Amino acid sequence: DPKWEFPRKNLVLGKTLGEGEFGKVVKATAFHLKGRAGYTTVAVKMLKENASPSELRDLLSEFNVLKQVNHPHVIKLYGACSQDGPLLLIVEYAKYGSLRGFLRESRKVGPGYLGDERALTMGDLISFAWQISQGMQYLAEMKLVHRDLAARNILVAEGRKMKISDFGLSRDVYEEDSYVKRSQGRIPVKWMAIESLFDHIYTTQSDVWSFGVLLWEIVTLGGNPYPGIPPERLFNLLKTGHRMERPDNCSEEMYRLMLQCWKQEPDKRPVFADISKDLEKMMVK
Amino acid sequence: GPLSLSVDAFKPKWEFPRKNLVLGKTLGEGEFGKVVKATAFHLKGRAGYTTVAVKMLKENASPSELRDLLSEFNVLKQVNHPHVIKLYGACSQDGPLLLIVEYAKYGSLRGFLRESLTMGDLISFAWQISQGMQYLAEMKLVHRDLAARNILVAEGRKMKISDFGLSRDVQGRIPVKWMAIESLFDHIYTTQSDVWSFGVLLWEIVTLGGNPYPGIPPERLFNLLKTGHRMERPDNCSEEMYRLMLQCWKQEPDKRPVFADISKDLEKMMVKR
Ligand SMILES: CO[C@]1(C(=O)N[C@@H](C)c2ccc(-n3cc(F)cn3)nc2)CC[C@H](c2nc(C)cc(Nc3cc(C)[nH]n3)n2)CC1
Numbered sequence: 238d239p240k241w242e243f244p245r246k247n248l249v250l251g252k253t254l255g256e257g258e259f260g261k262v263v264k265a266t267a268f269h270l271k272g273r274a275g276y277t278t279v280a281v282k283m284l285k286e287n288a289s290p291s292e293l294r295d296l297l298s299e300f301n302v303l304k305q306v307n308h309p310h311v312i313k314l315y316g317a318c319s320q321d322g323p324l325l326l327i328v329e330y331a332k333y334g335s336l337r338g339f340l341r342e343s344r345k346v347g348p349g350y351l352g353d354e355r356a357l358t359m360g361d362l363i364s365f366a367w368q369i370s371q372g373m374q375y376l377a378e379m380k381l382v383h384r385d386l387a388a389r390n391i392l393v394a395e396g397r398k399m400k401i402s403d404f405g406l407s408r409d410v411y412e413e414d415s416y417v418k419r420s421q422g423r424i425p426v427k428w429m430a431i432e433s434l435f436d437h438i439y440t441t442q443s444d445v446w447s448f449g450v451l452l453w454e455i456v457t458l459g460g461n462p463y464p465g466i467p468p469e470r471l472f473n474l475l476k477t478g479h480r481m482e483r484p485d486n487c488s489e490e491m492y493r494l495m496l497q498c499w500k501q502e503p504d505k506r507p508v509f510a511d512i513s514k515d516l517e518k519m520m521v522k
Numbered sequence: 523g524p525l526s527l528s529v530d531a532f533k534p535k536w537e538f539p540r541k542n543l544v545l546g547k548t549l550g551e552g553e554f555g556k557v558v559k560a561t562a563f564h565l566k567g568r569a570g571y572t573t574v575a576v577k578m579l580k581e582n583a584s585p586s587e588l589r590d591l592l593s594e595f596n597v598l599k600q601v602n603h604p605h606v607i608k609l610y611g612a613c614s615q616d617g618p619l620l621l622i623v624e625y626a627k628y629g630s631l632r633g634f635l636r637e638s639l640t641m642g643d644l645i646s647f648a649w650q651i652s653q654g655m656q657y658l659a660e661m662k663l664v665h666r667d668l669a670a671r672n673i674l675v676a677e678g679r680k681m682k683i684s685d686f687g688l689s690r691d692v693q694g695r696i697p698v699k700w701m702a703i704e705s706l707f708d709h710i711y712t713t714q715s716d717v718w719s720f721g722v723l724l725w726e727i728v729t730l731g732g733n734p735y736p737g738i739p740p741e742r743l744f745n746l747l748k749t750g751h752r753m754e755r756p757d758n759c760s761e762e763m764y765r766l767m768l769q770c771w772k773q774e775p776d777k778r779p780v781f782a783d784i785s786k787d788l789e790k791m792m793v794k795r
């Protein structure tokens with residue numbers, strides 16, 4: 238595609254920001270990038286030499302999705318180097334890294350959580366959730382289930398701006414408002430809705446479940462969900478009716494919103510436009 | 523679904539009591555799971571403590587990971603061969619799912635070779651793997667993920683085939699650089715695609731844990747293999763051995779050798795030394 242193909246000579250790759258088993262994200266710089274003069278700091282998502290067909294299909298799918306979606310709280314695609322070399326995916330540089338990493342740092346790093354850029358209040362945590370909810374509102378409007386919504390997969394940009402990232406597992410759902418796969422999914426079990434885990438059904442309403450898990454991560458400052466519980470235990474735990482308890486540092490109003498997101502029946506959960514309104518009513522109060 | 527049924531089913535011959543397992547140091551770990559050394563008291567009617575390896579999931583494990591671990595348990599109950607990694611059992615009643623397997627002291631074959639052995643030792647390793655694969659092929663088991671990282675090196679340098687989480691009897695998460703051409707283009711996995719992968723494993727042995735297709739990205743390999751290209755003859759490799767690699771990488775699966783032929787070729791190399 239000529240609108241997205243970037244000259245490889247103009248990209249210069251730097252240090253590794255982080256790494257999986259099959260791929261990595263490196264800090265980079267790009268010369269003469271989409272009208273800009275000079276160099277621009279960017280992130281490059283790419284595969285390792287041990288890459289599977291599924292990892293390659295997912296990186297290709299992330300590229301496809303990112304060409305079609307533009308939102309202030311969705312990570313911005315600049316382009317790709319995809320001829321005479323490996324597939325390099327050029328995306329916006331979010332300076333604070335993951336939301337999980339950012340929030341876990343605020344425990345350790347002063348001024349820290351307080352109930353400018355390192356001082357956090359409950360007001361700021363609600364704001365972060367609201368930004369992500371606004372991005373998911375838009376992504377649900379585009380007929381697009383993210384599936385892997387979690388605090389490790391949100392990035393934190395300049396001005397503490399939330400950027401939904403890691404679109405490799407996201408699927409189109411124009412067909413039937415649902416994505417169903419026969420085989421087992423690669424979403425971590427502790428972020429999955431009950432119908433996704435048991436029945437393999439992924440909708441906007443299972444992204445609402447996952448968002449509920451993200452809310453819990455946000456208020457506990459990057460907590461590990463279902464702490465100490467093996468992931469195989471989630472099948473029986475969720476079926477019988479159990480959900481994560483109210484974390485210390487969380488209002489009744491916020492916990493009701495979490496419990497709403499984790500209703501067994503997906504029609505009884507709130508849509509992303511309602512979630513945005515709840516968080517607005519929390520903010521103003 | 524399939525996994526909720528398996529998990530529930532999974533929760534006597536293979537149930538090891540948790541109180542007799544003492545987990546030791548971590549041997550290594552991926553994103554979603556780890557392998558730890560342990561001591562097992564009264565393991566399968568054996569006196570005292572037996573050193574074992576324990577595979578457990580990490581707490582961000584997916585359904586895919588959990589299925590693979592249960593699938594490995596399912597496969598390893600049906601197989602017993604000196605060059606396949608032995609299952610002793612599982613802890614399923616007391617906390618997380620622990621899979622208890624044979625302990626091989628030197629780690630992965632890839633890691634063993636990268637530390638480094640004569641050409642006779644290298645040919646002996648390829649033969650052992652080929653023997654275990656001849657056994658697996660006879661048991662109707664396609665391994666799928668044959669590679670030097672998925673072979674373990676036990677005491678006396680005995681090769682153990684391992685990592686049975688992706689094996690199937692009779693989308694894709696096997697790395698592109700080890701997959702057969704019909705696997706790449708048609709998603710077909712047979713004994714003859716294990717042969718292809720063994721050929722890549724054979725290349726890894728003679729290079730002392732080399733990275734296959736070095737400086738070619740996996741995305742470009744599809745069209746290089748389709749057109750006819752293969753890896754050239756590596757250094758410290760005979761004409762006889764390279765010919766055996768090239769035949770494992772024939773496009774048509776019928777033209778590739780079976781594992782009896784491979785073993786027979788390797789038996790004929792060692793007797794001529
Ligand atoms: C959560 O993401 C990180 C990580 O460790 N990811 C692992 C788990 C990971 C797994 C698979 C693959 N794959 C990449 C592929 F192409 C395929 N898989 N890459 C990485 C940790 C945070 C890191 C980062 N740190 C800082 C300080 C800034 C920053 N800015 C960014 C990052 C981006 C994309 N834009 N701007 N990113 C990015 C990588």
Ligand SMILES: CO[C@]1(C(=O)N[C@@H](C)c2ccc(-n3cc(F)cn3)nc2)CC[C@H](c2nc(C)cc(Nc3cc(C)[nH]n3)n2)CC1
Pocket residue numbers: 549550551552553554555556557574575577578579587591623624625626627628629630671672674684
């Ligand atoms: C290739 O295997 C190692 C590794 O780092 N693997 C990573 C990449 C990895 C990924 C996923 C999971 N998962 C485990 C799960 F349950 C799910 N995923 N575990 C580990 C490196 C070698 C290490 C080892 N070192 C030594 C010195 C000895 C040794 N002996 C053994 C090992 C066994 C099984 N029996 N005896 N093993 C075992 C782990």
